[PDB]
Amino acid sequence: AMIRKYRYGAPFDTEALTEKIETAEEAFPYGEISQKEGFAFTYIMDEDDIVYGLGESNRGINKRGYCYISNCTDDPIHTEDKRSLYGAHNFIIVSGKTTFGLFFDYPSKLTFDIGYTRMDTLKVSCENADLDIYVIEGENAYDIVKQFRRVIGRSYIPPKFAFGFGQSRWGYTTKEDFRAVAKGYRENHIPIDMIYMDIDYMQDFKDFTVNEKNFPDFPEFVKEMKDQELRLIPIIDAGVKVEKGYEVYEEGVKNNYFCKREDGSDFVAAVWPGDTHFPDMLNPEARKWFGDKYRFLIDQGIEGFWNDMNEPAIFYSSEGLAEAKEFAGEFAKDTEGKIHPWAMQAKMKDIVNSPEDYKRFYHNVNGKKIRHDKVHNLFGYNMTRAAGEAFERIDPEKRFLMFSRSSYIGMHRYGGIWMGDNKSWWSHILLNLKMLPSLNMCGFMYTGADLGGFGDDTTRDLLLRFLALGVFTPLMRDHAAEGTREQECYQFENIEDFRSVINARYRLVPYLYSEYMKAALNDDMYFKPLGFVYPDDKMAIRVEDQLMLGNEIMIAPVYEQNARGRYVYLPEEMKFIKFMPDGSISEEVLEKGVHYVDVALNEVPLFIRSGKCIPVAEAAECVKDIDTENMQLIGYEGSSYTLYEDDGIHKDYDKKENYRVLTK
Numbered sequence: 201a202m203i204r205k206y207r208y209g210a211p212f213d214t215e216a217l218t219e220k221i222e223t224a225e226e227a228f229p230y231g232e233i234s235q236k237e238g239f240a241f242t243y244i245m246d247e248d249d250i251v252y253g254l255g256e257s258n259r260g261i262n263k264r265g266y267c268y269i270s271n272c273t274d275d276p277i278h279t280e281d282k283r284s285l286y287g288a289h290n291f292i293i294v295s296g297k298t299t300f301g302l303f304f305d306y307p308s309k310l311t312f313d314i315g316y317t318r319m320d321t322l323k324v325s326c327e328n329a330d331l332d333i334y335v336i337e338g339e340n341a342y343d344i345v346k347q348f349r350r351v352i353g354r355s356y357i358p359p360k361f362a363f364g365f366g367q368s369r370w371g372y373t374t375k376e377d378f379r380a381v382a383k384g385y386r387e388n389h390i391p392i393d394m395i396y397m398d399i400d401y402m403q404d405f406k407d408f409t410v411n412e413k414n415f416p417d418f419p420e421f422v423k424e425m426k427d428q429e430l431r432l433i434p435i436i437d438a439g440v441k442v443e444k445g446y447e448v449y450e451e452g453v454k455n456n457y458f459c460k461r462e463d464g465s466d467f468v469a470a471v472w473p474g475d476t477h478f479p480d481m482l483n484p485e486a487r488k489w490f491g492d493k494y495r496f497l498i499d500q501g502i503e504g505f506w507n508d509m510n511e512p513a514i515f516y517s518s519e520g521l522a523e524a525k526e527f528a529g530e531f532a533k534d535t536e537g538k539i540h541p542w543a544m545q546a547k548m549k550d551i552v553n554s555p556e557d558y559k560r561f562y563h564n565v566n567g568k569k570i571r572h573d574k575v576h577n578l579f580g581y582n583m584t585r586a587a588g589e590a591f592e593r594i595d596p597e598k599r600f601l602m603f604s605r606s607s608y609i610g611m612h613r614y615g616g617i618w619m620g621d622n623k624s625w626w627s628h629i630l631l632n633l634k635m636l637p638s639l640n641m642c643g644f645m646y647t648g649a650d651l652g653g654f655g656d657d658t659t660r661d662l663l664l665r666f667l668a669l670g671v672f673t674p675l676m677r678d679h680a681a682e683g684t685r686e687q688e689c690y691q692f693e694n695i696e697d698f699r700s701v702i703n704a705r706y707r708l709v710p711y712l713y714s715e716y717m718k719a720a721l722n723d724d725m726y727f728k729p730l731g732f733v734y735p736d737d738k739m740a741i742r743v744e745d746q747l748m749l750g751n752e753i754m755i756a757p758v759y760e761q762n763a764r765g766r767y768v769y770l771p772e773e774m775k776f777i778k779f780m781p782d783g784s785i786s787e788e789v790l791e792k793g794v795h796y797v798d799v800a801l802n803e804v805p806l807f808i809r810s811g812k813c814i815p816v817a818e819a820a821e822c823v824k825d826i827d828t829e830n831m832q833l834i835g836y837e838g839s840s841y842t843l844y845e846d847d848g849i850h851k852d853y854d855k856k857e858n859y860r861v862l863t864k
């Protein structure tokens with residue numbers, strides 16, 4: 201009703217929305233539209249306007265002052281200059297005197313020039329005028345986000361164990377590796393629920409295999425781990441290894457389930473297994489086939505998966521590599537200095553994630569051929585869709601843990617996302633924080649970043665501050681790249697500080713799970729910018745390093761090295777709470793306004809809003825062992841809290857039995 205859909209040309213059906221909106225037949229209601237050069241929408245912003253949205257994208261909560269390109273890309277260096285990361289989340293909200301939301305339902309490269317060229321000018325452009333643009337009206341940004349959340353369908357809901365702590369590393373390969381992790385945590389009584397299995401668990405990186413040498417009785421290992429409340433979470437990649445006798449490959453070739461070149465052959469992309477084919481994720485029969493392969497792991501006791509490299513990432517194509525070797529032979533023969541090393545270096549970089557390669561393969565959509573670049577940002581989304589749909593077919597009532605690196609709006613119904621390859625940088629604590637509300641606006645609630653940083657070398661104090669933010673993010677996972685300084689919690693001196701921080705997570709799990717469930721079930725946000733909760737407070741609307749969570753608390757993590765506290769702005773009176781390393785809970789009332797709060801490395805801070813309280817459990821070492829029967833309430837006298845809790849396993853969300861009222 202307050203949502204209208206403006207159709208240009210003949211757009212591709214992304215299935216991002218679950219709700220049907222009729223095509224509007226009036227002139228576009230904001231700014232101006234031009235087709236002189238592909239498609240461009242231009243809008244002149246007021247100087248006080250804030251722009252929210254874009255889900256997983258670079259920089260801040262207010263998107264003004266830079267350029268953002270929705271073009272799912274495998275880029276491990278998230279510096280401020282980058283215009284594209286892994287996600288394509290084409291929803292923005294202009295917020296000010298004039299307020300409206302826009303969703304550009306377009307599956308290809310889409311450029312958001314948000315004051316980059318001229319500060320007052322918002323320009324959104326793409327190559328082809330074949331798209332739907334949804335215009336959402338409302339009193340404020342928050343109401344517009346809520347309408348949007350309604351029409352894109354309910355967010356993915358994880359199983360409760362996924363709210364525990366998880367540990368992973370690109371490098372764990374053998375039973376011994378995994379047992380050392382289990383032992384490193386359990387014998388030091390650091391809580392944990394999950395261990396991630398990265399690409400080395402497979403036989404030569406073949407999807408839907410297990411290295412039968414390292415795991416000759418894999419279901420028995422899965423049980424050994426699960427008996428200790430440790431759930432193994434295996435990676436699945438986009439590329440299917442080319443290899444004779446490998447059933448997944450053979451089936452794919454025989455039934456034409458792979459993406460093909462223009463000449464009809466199966467396109468070759470080299471990734472971890474060397475030569476691979478990509479399953480045609482936009483083909484329904486291929487998707488059913490590919491998703492059903494997950495049963496191979498599910499039958500073995502596996503309850504969760506993560507999907508990687510699904511941009512899809514390409515190290516090189518056969519075509520790219522041939523050009524590379526040819527160039528290199530010229531370089532090698534050059535004696536006159538006609539070919540500089542720089543040109544040689546550039547060619548080598550050019551064959552990776554090449555825009556040319558994305559034009560070299562096609563999807564078969566219900567019989568019709570579509571060049572991949574035209575639908576590039578739909579790939580990772582449909583790979584995760586394939587898995588989610590398969591889960592429904594095998595056990596309609598069971599929640600599986602599922603999250604994906606690349607995504608597009610619509611995928612939020614089928615899995616979460618992690619924020620990809622960050623770095624052990626202090627700036628990435630803050631980057632992690634700012635991405636949270638924007639993802640929430642776009643449907644992606646189950647999210648998190650690699651705690652401690654994926655690439656480069658972490659330090660003890662950096663890992664502790666990351667963990668203290670991760671305490672509040674639904675996906676809380678310590679994961680590192682190969683070759684990095686080891687960053688399992690037991691690798692550092694005074695490990696009692698890591699126990700204290702992760703203890704805080706487990707004490708908060710019933711509250712955090714409850715808020716997640718209440719928000720997901722009501723198409724609402726888990727994390728919100730302060731401006732959404734205090735929209736009449738000009739100071740509050742511009743705060744970017746604090747977030748509101750549910751309706752009870754605010755978080756404000758320390759993200760500066762050597763800092764012993766940080767500044768905060770409280771838009772109302774709050775109780776400043778700290779989980780202390782001795783197990784106690786420090787509390788102090790603070791009035792509305794500016795404060796510097798002391799927060800030590802081994803203290804986890806939060807703020808409880810006036811007239812609110814939250815339940816806190818005693819610390820336990822796995823989700824199953826959390827005692828929720830008579831939790832302590834922290835916060836304001838005379839307040840109450842409605843706890844959501846179900847069995848954490850099935851999908852019986854609609855019971856009054858799931859809710860109970862607690863009173864301080």
Ligand SMILES: OCCN1C[C@H](O)[C@@H](O)[C@H](O)[C@H]1CO
Pocket residue numbers: 369370398399435508509605620621679680681
């Ligand atoms: O080329 C790298 C592929 N992968 C990228 C993922 O983002 C990361 O989490 C993972 O550890 C890594 C190895 O599986």
